[PDB]
């Protein structure tokens, strides 16, 4: 199987360990990850979608055409990038006039959006294309960890369009986490936003850090050993915002933040240096 590999910004530019773990995991699963040469910001929906829909849609459509050139579906492991690309894809596919406008903009770049590929999420690809049994076969180091699963807002919502799992009480990520031997611990307001989406992190850092502080308070009361996410934007929020919360209010949580790919790599006995824990601000 072949799939185009979209990287985004935060993963490749702040946390390369997630990227390396994903590459190793997909090599072990016999899935060929094809680089999307010349890919850019998806662009981050929080700022660009809030500023100008046309620009956001055009940049996302160019990113989609990069993969369309290779005739491969796009695979993303960021909830923000998945949301942006998927929304642009299903907006252009189902709207002829908007497609014509975006193609008029794209013309000067020597590209045209055809609506020929699909945008897919990393967890969804793992659950459907691989399956829990083959994920389980590859586990060599069954983990002993109590983890708090942070789904992120844009993995499952808007569910009417994504139709992956129930947004109120989903179980896909919990199952993918538990095939590793770790235990997904229920905690209060589990489906709550981390506070970084919608451009709030850069607009009002205090509000986003309050989101994160509430989530961390709930997670700590449940006893977790770590936070597991499928969004480098949520990953960055938790990691950097724990330090910011300590600096601003002197509150210590010391809850390591792991991407789902990193957890799978840990359960699959990947080399430690491949996880690139040095990138994380919170010591793991």
């Amino acid at each position: 199987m072949e799939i185009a590999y979209f990287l985004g910004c935060i993963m490749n530019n702040r946390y390369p360990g997630i990227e390396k773990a994903t590459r190793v995991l997909f090599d072990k699963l016999g899935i060929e990850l094809k680089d999307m040469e010349g890919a850019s910001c998806c662009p981050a929906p929080g700022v660009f979608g809030s500023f100008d829909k046309t620009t956001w849609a055009a940049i996302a459509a160019r990113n989609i055409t990069i993969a369309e050139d290779m005739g491969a579906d796009i695979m993303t492991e960021c909830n923000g990038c998945f949301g942006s690309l998927f929304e642009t894809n299903h907006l252009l596919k189902e709207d002829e006039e908007m497609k014509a406008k975006i193609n008029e903009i794209l013309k000067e770049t020597g590209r045209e959006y055809k609506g020929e590929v699909n945008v897919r999420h990393f967890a969804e690809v793992l659950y459907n294309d691989v399956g829990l049994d083959k994920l389980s076969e590859l586990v060599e180091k069954p983990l002993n960890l109590n983890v708090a699963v942070h789904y992120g807002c844009h993995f499952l919502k808007p569910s009417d369009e994504i139709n992956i799992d129930n947004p109120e009480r989903p179980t896909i990520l919990d199952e993918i986490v538990e095939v590793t031997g770790a235990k997904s611990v229920e905690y209060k307001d589990k489906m709550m936003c981390c506070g970084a989406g919608g451009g709030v992190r850069s607009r009002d850092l205090d509000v986003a850090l309050d989101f994160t502080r509430e989530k961390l308070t709930n997670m700590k009361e449940a006893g977790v050993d770590a936070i597991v996410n499928v969004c480098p934007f949520c990953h960055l929020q938790f990691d950097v915002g724990q330090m910011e919360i300590k600096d601003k209010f002197g509150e210590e949580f010391d809850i390591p933040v792991l991407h789902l790919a990193q957890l799978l790599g840990l359960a699959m006995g990947l080399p430690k240096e491949d996880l690139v824990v040095d990138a994380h601000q919170v010591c793991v």
Partner: protein, 183 residues
Amino acid sequence: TLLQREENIIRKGNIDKEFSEKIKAAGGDSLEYCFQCGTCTGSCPSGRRTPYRVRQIIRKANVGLKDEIISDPTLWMCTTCYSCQERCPRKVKIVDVVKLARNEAAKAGFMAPAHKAVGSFVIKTGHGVPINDATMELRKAVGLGELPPTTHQFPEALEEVQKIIKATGFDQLIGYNWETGEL
């Protein structure tokens, strides 16, 4: 004094019907059939810690209080978590309306400097979060390339991104000046 003769009453002078018609025509028509149950506000995590009230935003959009909406700082408290939209009993596309209102506000000049900085980063390097030297070293150490195979590595891709930005007028929107490469 508590006196203020304009802030405490709504007349036709505060209403812009063209704003409401524009919002509905641009994909926020569902806001027409909000019956103001308040489920969205109860579900809103930002409404619990800020003066942001999404239900009142929907109501103002329906009424046509443009100046009250676009100039409102609380409009930027929405994280687009979609919690409200999943639970709306009238199936209103709340997040779509919020984003359209934010677009109108940006057109009116209510853009925060940090968001403009993110836009300028995208313009200059194609990445909202461009790579730094430490991450380059980390990438090299772990077997990955020094640069990701993105606009960081391909100047022509960055030129295409800049062409797209120029075509849509995004550079003018955030006041990016190509000559000096500043805002």
